[PDB]
Amino acid sequence: VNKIAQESKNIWKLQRAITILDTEKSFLKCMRKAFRSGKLLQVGFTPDGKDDYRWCFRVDEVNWTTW
Amino acid sequence: GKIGVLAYILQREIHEPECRHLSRKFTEWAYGPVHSSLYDLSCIDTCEKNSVLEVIAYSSSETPNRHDMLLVEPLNRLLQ
Amino acid sequence: KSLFVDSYSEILFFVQSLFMLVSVVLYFSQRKEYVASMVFSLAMGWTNMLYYTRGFQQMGIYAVMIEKMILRDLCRFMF
Amino acid sequence: TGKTCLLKAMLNLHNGQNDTIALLLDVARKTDSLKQFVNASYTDSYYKGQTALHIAIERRNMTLVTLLVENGADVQAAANGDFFKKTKGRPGFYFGELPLSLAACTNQLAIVKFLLQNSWQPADISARDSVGNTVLHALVEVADNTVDNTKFVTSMYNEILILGAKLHPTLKLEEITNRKGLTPLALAASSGKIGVLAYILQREIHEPECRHLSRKFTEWAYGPVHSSLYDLSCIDTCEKNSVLEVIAYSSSETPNRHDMLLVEPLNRLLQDKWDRFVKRIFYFNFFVYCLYMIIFTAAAYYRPVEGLPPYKLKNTVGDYFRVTGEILSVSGGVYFFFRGIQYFLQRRPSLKSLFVDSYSEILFFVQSLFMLVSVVLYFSQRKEYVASMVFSLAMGWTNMLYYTRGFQQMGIYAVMIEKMILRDLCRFMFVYLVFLFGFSTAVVTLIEDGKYNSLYSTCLELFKFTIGMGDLEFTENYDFKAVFIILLLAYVILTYILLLNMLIALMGETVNKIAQESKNIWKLQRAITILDTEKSFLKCMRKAFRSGKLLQVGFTPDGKDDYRWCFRVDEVNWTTW
Amino acid sequence: VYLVFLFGFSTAVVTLIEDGKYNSLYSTCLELFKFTIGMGDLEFTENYDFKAVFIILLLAYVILTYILLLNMLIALMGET
Ligand SMILES: CCCCCCCCCCCCC(=O)O[C@@H](COC(=O)CCC)COP(=O)(O)O[C@H]1[C@H](O)[C@@H](O)[C@@H](O)[C@@H](O)[C@@H]1O
Ligand SMILES: CCCCCCCCCCCCC(=O)O[C@@H](COC(=O)CCC)COP(=O)(O)O[C@H]1[C@H](O)[C@@H](O)[C@@H](O)[C@@H](O)[C@@H]1O
């Protein structure tokens, strides 16, 4: 038990990930809300004049250094 | 199971002209110490065949770091 | 080999169902031994309840620890 | 949104420069007027109140700050839009809404000093935002107990105090309260900002005309030895938010509520209070409770065995003693009942703090409830009162462990018992009960027309394995003996060999990790005991107020002298002669 | 701690019992002690009413002393 704590957390997270993927693959209801994060424009400037919408996922962060 | 390369790619941010579009991590706003980043998630959440989540989850049990790869930041937050 | 070194829960649920089906066959085969099958399935069914401890962080991690104890320490000790 | 061209230009700076800003300001001057232009601000509910000065500060552009202030910008413009509120469910950044608090919250000391000591419009250092929080309150808010954050927050807090004293010697910044009545010290204590609290409580300022601001003073220092003094104002006692009261009666969600009492003056003060005042009272309370439980045990043990209570009192000594003990036991039950109600009413727990914390008061209340139910059944002519009474009796004896606090060795042991029950026994009992019920159902299904053949008897019979009494051949009323024995062996292996030994391993793992947490929790438990004792006190005793009214500096900002009830701590150092 | 638990539940059980073979603080104290050494009968008497109360008391005692406290003692001695 002293040695498998982190391994146990990792395996649990993997087991939950498998459950999630099976649920989203089955879904029994033609639900599209399983597709998360929203179709946002990251740059809006591809190598050509077009804009790129890339389904990005938002993460807030706070840092008190490197002002 | 090349966790290092995966960790690099998923949060790659390129600060120069004509190579911004190559990034997969973008910073939208940053007021003070607070800033809101955006991860790409193309071919992570869903795609034609090889979604990264599908590839890791349905790995063959011999991949070296199949347990650790999900600790990479955007994947952990996305699964939660 | 991947069939047995990994995906234990699929095996256990499948074996539960196998015992159930053998129970049905014996039941309609006019053998009392269907009871012998049924109880085994019943026992396994309740132990397979632990499959659902995932989704609960404390209990899921605990269940993984139980799994690993069975595979490593209980196996060596029992031999 | 309502943003003007100036605000658009300010949000687009190239290496901190944008020449069109001075162009727009000069044009505004020459057109009609500037004061409305330079104070233009957003109107939408998200960025409401944001103005160019805020943008200058957050961009860390000194030049624009100086220019905008010079041109008559409002240094008291409050940005109270939704992005500038706490609002845990939305993104944003709280900083106190004011340019001075914004400068302080972003580690920009030069801008703070300029805003305070500019020629055109100096900032009001005592100003308060919509929440009532002034700069010091905001600085407490932005703390998160991390090293790099805490360093600058403590430093800026120090510097703002120095500047406030120099500019307004008669102003007492730390005495300002927000809408909640909290001073920055009380706010730091309530919110668990242990770093800032540790800074404040032992603050020492070595310079003339700022000595009075310190809270740690050195009276004499002969050689390596020197005797320091801690202020203890608003720690030991005050109007509302005593620091000890704030920490002890925290809502259990405060991050560092266990750690905050490790701060030196608090720990020494609590120990002094204990030894001087509370130790004797607590021991006496323990003695009284022991007498109560002995009397209750004696009353219950000698209950009559005839049917149909209540029972006629026999004119004999033993029955007089029995009914006397019964009356006293019911009295004590009522006492703990009303104490539980009083605790609930005074603390008003929000139905989660009622269960996730304060287990002792719940247990004593439950004991008293069982006593009252016992009385009701007793006079209701039901023998079932016995069923109630015994539970109360059992709980009463186990509640004796409540008094293991106040003993350093035993209280830690009691805390570890609590943690074992809450973590490891709960997880084990869930899994064990799943296995037990599953195999019980299997075995009782196999058994037919036997003595057992029933869920209760088979469950108990399998449970006997856990206590080392499993028969392993308790019945033959089945067919397929091989199936029966296989089930029992599998149950034994899975539960007895694996799970109990795994429980031992996990308890060993847990004990290795909760040593310091146990010391902190025990210290907190004893602190709560001390505060309750000094709060009730039943005699109007003034010895509870410790440390003695000493003169610290004797030189306030005016010629008055300061008597601050300081607490003396003697210390030695064999370095830095 | 163990003696507090033992005495508390002994007094509870001997209170519940009436006019039995045990019906005495010593006999019940010894009988509950037998659980600690792995010899607890768990049905040592029926001289009561309220069987559910009796069995609930014994199970609570067993859980608190045998399962919790003894394993806790082992863990603490390991730390020591
Ligand atoms: C007569 C009665 C006999 C019953 C005997 C059985 C008792 C336990 C029953 C409890 C049920 C728990 C369960 O359902 O199975 C547990 C483990 O079961 C065992 O330990 C079998 C011991 C044989 C988790 O199974 P899982 O599918 O998650 O396997 C994990 C992969 O998924 C994951 O990707 C990783 O590769 C990870 O390394 C894998 O483990
Ligand atoms: C039929 C018979 C059954 C008896 C069942 C019960 C047996 C145990 C009886 C032992 C009595 C010990 C006791 O009297 O209670 C112990 C806790 O024991 C339990 O775990 C009860 C589980 C229910 C201390 O409770 P405490 O009030 O100190 O809670 C702490 C706060 O005070 C502190 O400020 C912190 O917030 C900390 O996080 C809190 O924990």
CSV table of C-alpha atoms in Angstrom, one decimal, chain D residues 297 300-301 303-305 383-387 389-391 393-394 397-398 400-401 404 410 413 415-418 420-421 425 428-429 432 456 460-461 463-464 466-469 496 500 503-504 507-509 511-513 515, chain E residues 1-2 4-5 7-9 11-19 23-26 35 37-43 49-57 59 62-64 66-76 79:
chain,number,residue,atom,x,y,z
D,297,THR,CA,-25.1,3.0,35.4
D,300,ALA,CA,-30.0,1.2,35.2
D,301,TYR,CA,-28.3,-1.9,36.6
D,303,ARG,CA,-33.9,-1.6,37.4
D,304,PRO,CA,-36.8,-3.8,38.4
D,305,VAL,CA,-37.8,-6.7,36.3
D,383,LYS,CA,-41.2,-1.9,28.5
D,384,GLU,CA,-39.4,-0.7,25.4
D,385,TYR,CA,-38.0,2.2,27.5
D,386,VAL,CA,-35.3,-0.3,28.4
D,387,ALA,CA,-34.3,-0.5,24.7
D,389,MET,CA,-32.0,3.5,28.0
D,390,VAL,CA,-29.3,1.0,27.2
D,391,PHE,CA,-28.4,2.8,24.0
D,393,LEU,CA,-26.0,4.2,28.6
D,394,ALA,CA,-23.7,2.8,25.9
D,397,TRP,CA,-19.7,5.7,28.3
D,398,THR,CA,-18.3,6.1,24.8
D,400,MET,CA,-16.4,9.6,28.0
D,401,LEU,CA,-13.7,9.8,25.3
D,404,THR,CA,-9.5,12.8,26.3
D,410,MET,CA,-4.7,10.8,24.9
D,413,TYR,CA,-5.2,9.0,20.3
D,415,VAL,CA,-8.4,12.2,17.2
D,416,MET,CA,-6.8,9.3,15.4
D,417,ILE,CA,-9.7,7.1,16.4
D,418,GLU,CA,-12.1,9.6,14.8
D,420,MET,CA,-9.9,5.9,11.4
D,421,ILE,CA,-13.6,5.6,11.7
D,425,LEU,CA,-13.6,1.8,8.6
D,428,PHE,CA,-13.9,-1.2,4.6
D,429,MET,CA,-17.5,-1.6,5.9
D,432,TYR,CA,-17.1,-6.0,3.5
D,456,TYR,CA,-30.6,-13.5,9.1
D,460,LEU,CA,-24.8,-14.0,11.2
D,461,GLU,CA,-23.2,-17.4,10.6
D,463,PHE,CA,-20.2,-12.9,10.1
D,464,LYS,CA,-18.9,-15.3,12.7
D,466,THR,CA,-14.9,-12.3,10.8
D,467,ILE,CA,-14.5,-12.6,14.6
D,468,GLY,CA,-12.7,-15.9,14.3
D,469,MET,CA,-15.6,-18.2,15.2
D,496,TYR,CA,-10.8,-12.7,6.3
D,500,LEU,CA,-9.0,-7.5,7.2
D,503,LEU,CA,-7.5,-2.9,6.5
D,504,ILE,CA,-4.6,-3.2,8.8
D,507,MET,CA,-4.6,1.9,8.8
D,508,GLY,CA,-0.9,1.7,9.1
D,509,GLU,CA,-0.6,3.8,6.0
D,511,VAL,CA,-1.4,6.6,10.8
D,512,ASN,CA,1.9,7.5,9.0
D,513,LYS,CA,0.2,10.6,7.5
D,515,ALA,CA,0.5,12.7,13.0
E,1,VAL,CA,-10.0,3.4,25.7
E,2,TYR,CA,-10.7,-0.3,25.4
E,4,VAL,CA,-14.1,2.4,28.5
E,5,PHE,CA,-15.7,0.6,25.6
E,7,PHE,CA,-17.4,-1.3,30.4
E,8,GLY,CA,-19.9,0.8,28.5
E,9,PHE,CA,-21.2,-2.1,26.5
E,11,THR,CA,-23.2,-2.2,31.4
E,12,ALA,CA,-25.6,-1.9,28.4
E,13,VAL,CA,-25.8,-5.6,27.8
E,14,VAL,CA,-26.2,-6.6,31.5
E,15,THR,CA,-28.9,-3.9,31.8
E,16,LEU,CA,-30.7,-5.4,28.9
E,17,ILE,CA,-30.5,-8.9,30.2
E,18,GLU,CA,-32.9,-9.8,33.0
E,19,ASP,CA,-33.1,-12.8,35.4
E,23,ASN,CA,-27.2,-11.0,34.6
E,24,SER,CA,-24.2,-9.7,36.4
E,25,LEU,CA,-21.4,-7.2,35.6
E,26,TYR,CA,-18.6,-9.7,35.9
E,35,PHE,CA,-14.7,-11.3,21.7
E,37,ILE,CA,-9.5,-13.1,22.0
E,38,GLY,CA,-11.6,-14.4,19.1
E,39,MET,CA,-13.9,-16.6,21.2
E,40,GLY,CA,-17.0,-14.4,21.4
E,41,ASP,CA,-20.1,-16.5,21.4
E,42,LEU,CA,-22.4,-13.8,19.9
E,43,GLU,CA,-25.4,-15.8,21.1
E,49,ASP,CA,-36.5,-9.2,25.3
E,50,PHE,CA,-35.5,-7.0,22.3
E,51,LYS,CA,-33.2,-9.3,20.5
E,52,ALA,CA,-32.5,-6.6,17.9
E,53,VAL,CA,-31.2,-4.4,20.6
E,54,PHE,CA,-29.0,-7.1,22.0
E,55,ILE,CA,-27.5,-8.0,18.7
E,56,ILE,CA,-27.1,-4.4,17.7
E,57,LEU,CA,-25.2,-3.7,20.9
E,59,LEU,CA,-22.2,-5.8,16.7
E,62,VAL,CA,-17.4,-5.9,17.9
E,63,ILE,CA,-16.9,-3.2,15.3
E,64,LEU,CA,-15.6,-0.6,17.7
E,66,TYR,CA,-12.3,-5.9,17.6
E,67,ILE,CA,-12.3,-4.4,14.1
E,68,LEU,CA,-11.3,-0.8,14.8
E,69,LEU,CA,-9.4,-0.7,18.0
E,70,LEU,CA,-7.2,-3.8,17.7
E,71,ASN,CA,-6.2,-3.0,14.1
E,72,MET,CA,-5.6,0.6,15.2
E,73,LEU,CA,-3.3,-0.7,18.0
E,74,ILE,CA,-1.4,-2.7,15.4
E,75,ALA,CA,-1.0,0.4,13.2
E,76,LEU,CA,0.2,2.5,16.1
E,79,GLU,CA,4.5,3.6,13.8
